[PDB]
Design a protein around this ligand. Sequence first.
Ligand SMILES: [Mg+2]
Ligand SMILES: [Mg+2]
Ligand SMILES: [Mg+2]
Ligand SMILES: [Mg+2]
Ligand SMILES: [Mg+2]
Ligand SMILES: [Mg+2]
Ligand SMILES: [Mg+2]
Ligand SMILES: [Mg+2]
Ligand SMILES: [Mg+2]
Ligand SMILES: [Mg+2]
Lengths: 106, 55, 14, 117, 88
Amino acid sequence: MRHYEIVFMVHPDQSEQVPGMIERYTAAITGAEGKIHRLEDWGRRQLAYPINKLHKAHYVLMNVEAPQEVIDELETTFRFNDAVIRSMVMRTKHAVTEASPMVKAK
Amino acid sequence: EIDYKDIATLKNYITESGKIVPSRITGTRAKYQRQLARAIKRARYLSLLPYTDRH
Amino acid sequence: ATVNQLVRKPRARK
Amino acid sequence: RKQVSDGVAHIHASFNNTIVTITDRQGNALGWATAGGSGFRGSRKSTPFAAQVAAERCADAVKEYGIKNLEVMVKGPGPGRESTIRALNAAGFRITNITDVTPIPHNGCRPPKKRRV
Amino acid sequence: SLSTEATAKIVSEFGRDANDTGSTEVQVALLTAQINHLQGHFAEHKKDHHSRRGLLRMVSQRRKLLDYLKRKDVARYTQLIERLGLRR
RNA sequence: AAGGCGGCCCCCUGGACGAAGACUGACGCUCAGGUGCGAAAGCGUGGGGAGCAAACAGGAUUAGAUACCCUGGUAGUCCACGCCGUAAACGAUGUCGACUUGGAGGUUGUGCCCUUGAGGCGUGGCUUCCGGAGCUAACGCGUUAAGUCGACCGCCUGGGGA
Ligand SMILES: [Mg+2]
Ligand SMILES: [Mg+2]
Ligand SMILES: [Mg+2]
Ligand SMILES: [Mg+2]
Ligand SMILES: [Mg+2]
Ligand SMILES: [Mg+2]
Ligand SMILES: [Mg+2]
Ligand SMILES: [Mg+2]
Ligand SMILES: [Mg+2]
Ligand SMILES: [Mg+2]
């Protein structure tokens, strides 16, 4: 089974809608035998360059261990939702559980 | 082993104009140099490092 | 050069 | 007639002509001067002294706004890159920011052919 | 080729024990299941001529290994050709 | 395998290489016809169109400018679906195996070591520049041979005609 690191950032005007999207996406993963390793909320964060005429983007970092059922639907509902402006997934080497350098300083 | 999240390592490996310093100047290993290149290209999409000194 | 090549076709005399 | 007190100099530098243009921080143009109409034509237009009076004559048309702190934006690989910055200090200004803003494509379009001579 | 559960089971299917993995009849079955795995891939990906080289390698590799068992002991040959669906 | 292949990310998928053993037992090498891939131009049908740009438009140059230079500009370059199968498709060296002094490095691993530092010591895979013996018409090659040999195949027989 694959090991994914899922990066998605939220539109800053809907920053209170973030914990709703945390637990709605999680219940579809864990029901189909999908594990979870890291769930870190960062709040607003300053951008290196502006994107979609905005500033101070909300950042949420994830690690999802799950089969290929979630990789079809979750990337489409990111493109279906207007809240997520950037979605990025990547395959990792192992199931990892380690705090980010953003949390270790903040 | 190397990762894109530790931006303090990535600040030591770029210029003021966002250009990637090659391994000739820093004297790093060639195994990490391909890995540091794609790690910046991950961070370049995630708006962590600027492309140029223009914006 | 190979003898086994000359089994298929000998050297063509002009 | 109007007060802005914040200058931005988008100066141009090509091989044939150098163009000095004063504007504000918000895109609204304030004045320009080209080396073609400055008494320099053709080979005389491609001289660094043509950029020495183009920056001064453009600066004399933007002192109506009372600009003291300006920004210098150098755009292009053309000659005269030094003669137009020293000429801004010769017009009585306080030089603050100098920034190369030369457009560099990431191999976007195909460049034209060679000029074999 | 495959995962660990698909590889180790077929070795236990046609081998006498878990150690019987280097024999020719196992090597036919490793190529038989792999070509059967790639039936739907090359139908959708006819412009992938580079992975077709890996496919034509394994077809040529299976043909050479069928020629060894046929020339030595035909009793084990007649078992495996119908047990995997060969000879068309 | 070669022509070649370069933003990032996912999915599918191919070979290469290394370590520890276990296991089949020559299952191999090579290849005329046959079979598939095969730069770009161009051809067929239907899309697509920034930039560049045959023919061509126009201006300089000039003896004339057809070319050069410059301002424009269609086919094409883009994608799907085929066909075309030729190149200075070159390492101008067909493939495989066995051996024969060596260095400067690069890339990629692995084994051990006051871990006493990303190091010390070994040891395979890949790759470039020097260079001994030897070979060579000379140039140069020289453990990746064009050195010494084997297995097999292609090809050449004065130049031009061609
Ligand atoms: Mg593999
Ligand atoms: Mg035995
Ligand atoms: Mg046509
Ligand atoms: Mg022309
Ligand atoms: Mg066409
Ligand atoms: Mg030819
Ligand atoms: Mg040569
Ligand atoms: Mg010598
Ligand atoms: Mg040599
Ligand atoms: Mg003749």
